Amino acid sequence: DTSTLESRVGHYYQMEDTYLVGREKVREFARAVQDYHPAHWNLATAADLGHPGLIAPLTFTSAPAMACNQRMFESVVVGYDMYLQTEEVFEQHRPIVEGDELSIDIELTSVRRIAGRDLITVTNTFTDTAGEVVHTLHTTVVGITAEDVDPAIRPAVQGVMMHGINMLGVEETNAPYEKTVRPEGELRIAQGGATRTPTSLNFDDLKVGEELPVHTARLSRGDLVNYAGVAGDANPLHWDENIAKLAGQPDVIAHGMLTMGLGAGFVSSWSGDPGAITRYAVRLSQPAVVPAEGTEIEYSGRIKSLDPETRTGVVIVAAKSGGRKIFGLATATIRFS
Amino acid sequence: DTSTLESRVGHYYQMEDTYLVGREKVREFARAVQDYHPAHWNLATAADLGHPGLIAPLTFTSAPAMACNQRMFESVVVGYDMYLQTEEVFEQHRPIVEGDELSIDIELTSVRRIAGRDLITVTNTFTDTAGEVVHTLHTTVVGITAEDVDPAIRPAVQGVMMHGINMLGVEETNAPYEKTVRPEGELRIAQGGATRTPTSLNFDDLKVGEELPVHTARLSRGDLVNYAGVAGDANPLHWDENIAKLAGQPDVIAHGMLTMGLGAGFVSSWSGDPGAITRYAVRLSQPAVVPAEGTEIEYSGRIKSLDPETRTGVVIVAAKSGGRKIFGLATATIRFS
């Protein structure tokens, strides 16, 4: 019997179709998170920096993962129709490049009951054509109940939800539920991120406690609408003020993933090499409210630790907006040159 | 002297960067226009249908063209900050396929003063790696003046406009104005669309006057938001109800290009072969209003003419929504089997 969410921990499935990383999509995603690092844009500079093509922004993986995760949240995670992102971890085992063809899987890797609530973590891995895991994504959400929101939210949402169907794996996606687990393991993690020469700041120029310069990002309703289409996030909390209020927010709120992407761009603008960020972990705090006049998010940070053996460091990243703390604890692990 | 819009007719520029057509973007665009023809989705079926990969939906070209056309409408077309799409023509000289790498140019091909108004036509051509024009796009807009709209629209628009910058050709895009024309011609038009074997309906099964079955498309605010990001259209008339009203509309309105894309999918669902539509010409009428509860657009059509020599026909396409006529005269020229 697998009637309970708790009993379904370990549920695993693979997408039948690969995901081909395209050059123009890399640029489009970079644009959507206001990331202008040349490695995401310019072929000649990407080559100068040792890449075989443009590399993806760190949080790019959120877009194909959300598509893959539809069955998990619709059919597998029973008990909830609505979710709130609380935490994300991005592991960049090697930089993803234009022309990568990735096999994506989905695993319900934990369900934890905390303060009457369920914290639900879904893990995706991205495997390349050499059969190596190039990226691991951990998404944690809390389950939201009917009692958390105005009942009027459901007809409102039905009224605005997009209609476009993802025809890929649409049969397997909508099949009846039955439990499946990950086959017996030994996955091979890509080592390229650890062995490549970083194009980041020189390790020896750094000190523990060094502050990153403060960066102000501007965020508008149009940024959110653009991100919704580019990243394939259909949730109207990010563009319908009425529905956002029915959900108990004071106005439209930014995608959690978007504020994380702006944070990754903040880190790579400072460090110099998007490919050198091997881990990025963000706990969210308060949502970033985006009114019709627009808002700002201020990113800041400092070096928490340095390791001279591996010439790596950990940076704490902070984000604040409209009088609110947007990030809780957030860190980036970075390889330096 | 080129101070006047009229004197600038013939203005021409090329994008420095090619545009690489990606497999997943083809799928994403198809999804955005609710087009589920297998040639846009399934690799094995696309092969069965004689294609070397997925082919693009007919109106796919609108997305890269809009990016290219930024300089034309911002810096070249002087006198107007705001435009209304009135007419489009798509010429599919051969079907665009995943992996195509296209060189795009931009030409101000006519400015016509009609009833105190300027009808402004901008033509794009898409040239492949064999130096052949595979697609020609003609976009006609009418110039909209400050007096056509509530003055409050400008601060409102400023408040919501997206920030993400297209770094490609950003220097040439923002350079001072100076007139340039198309070099001395002889362009080579791709003949593949004319010589390939169509996978459409058999010509001999058709009759002049035959009605296409009526199709109801559903359109929601979320469809429009998704299209805005997927197609890179930053205009808030398609997702901000306040700004739409300041623009004199009764509510949010659908992208003209989106209603045209739904029309192309309607035609190819009937004809059987998206690649067989060699020309698609649409004059718009009234905008499709999209309220918070959603709406419908009804597509209909009939065979206008048949040519047994080339085994082609012309179909008239009609579209109506919320009590309004959405299309004026609209036709598709189709090769039959």
Which tokens in the block code for residue A128? 């390349």
| Contacts with A184 (C-beta within 8 Å, 6 or more apart), sequence order | none
Under 8 Å between Cβ of A278 and A195: no
- Taking alpha carbons only, the member of B235, B252, B242, B13 closest to residue B144 is B235
Close Cβ partners of B284 (under 8 Å, ≥ 6 residues apart): B85, B86, B87, B256, B259, B326, B327, B328
Between chains, do A162 and B220 touch, taking CB under 8 Å as contact? yes
CB contact under 8 A, B221 and A159: yes
Q: CB neighbours (10 Å) of residue B94? A: 22
**Of the candidates A159, A133, A109, the residue with the CA atom closest to the CA atom of residue B294:** A159
- Measured between beta carbons, the chain B residues lying within 8 angstroms of A167 are 27, 30-31, 36, 41-42
CA distance A293 to B243: 12
What the block records as the tokens of A233 is 């996030």
Q: Which approach determined this entry? A: X-ray
To probe the interface with A, which of B162, B215, B255 has the most A CB atoms within 10 Å? B162
Closest partner CB to B161 (pick from A28, A161, A222): A222
d(CA A280, CA B229): 26
Neighbouring-strand partners of residue B19: B102
Q: Name the residue facing B225 among A156, A228, A294 (closest C-beta).
A: A228
Q: Which of B177, B137, B231 is nearest to B13 (CA)?
A: B177
Closest Cα partner for B288 from B229, B217, B209, B234? B217
Mark which residues 16-55 of B lie under 8 Å from A by CB: 19-25, 27-28, 30-34, 36, 41-42
Q: Phi/psi at A89 (nearest 5 deg)?
A: -130, 130
Between CA B46 and CA A271 the distance in angstroms is 44
| Burial track B156-180 (b if 16+ CB lie within 10 A, e otherwise) | bbebbebebebbbbeeebeeeeeee
B242 in reach of chain A (CB within 8 A): yes
> CA-to-CA distance for A30 and B165, rounded, in angstroms?
9
**Angstrom distance (rounded) from CA B228 to CA B234:** 6
Helices (H), B6-78: 23-32, 43-48, 62-68, 70-71
Burial class (CB in 10 A: 0-12, 13-18, 19+), B44: exposed
Angle between the A221-231 and B221-231 helix axes, to the nearest 10 degrees?
Answer: 80
Of B242, B267, B247, B236, give the one whose Cα is nearest residue B335: B267
Kindly identify which residue of chain A lies nearest to residue B27, measuring between CA atoms: A166
Nearest Cα neighbor of B259 from B283, B240, B275, B235 is B283
Q: Helix (H) and strand (E) counts for chain B?
A: 10, 12
Which of A156-190 are b and which e, b meaning 16 or more Cβ less than 10 Å from the residue's Cβ?
A: bbebbebebebbbbeeebeeeeeeeebeeeeeebb
CA distance A195 to chain B (A): 30
Cα separation, B321 vs B317, whole angstroms: 14
Alpha helices, H only, A125-255: 153-160, 170-173, 192-195, 221-231, 241-246
Instruction: Answer whether B229's CB lies under 8 Å from A32's CB.
Output: yes
Measured between CB atoms, does A219 come within 8 Å of chain B?
yes
Query: How many domains is chain B built from?
Result: 1
Nearest CA-CA distance, residue B188 and chain A, Å: 26
Closest residue to A229, CB basis, from B33, B218, B225: B225
Q: Which residues have C-beta within 8 Å of that of residue B202, sequence separation ≥ 6?
A: B336, B337
Partner residues linked to A279 by β-bridges? A91, A333
Rounded to an integer, what is the distance from CA B170 to the centroid of its chain?
A: 23
Q: Which residue range forms the structural domain that includes residue A118?
A: 1-337
Q: What is the resolution of this structure in A?
A: 1.5
DSSP B61: G
Closest Cα in chain A to B25: A25
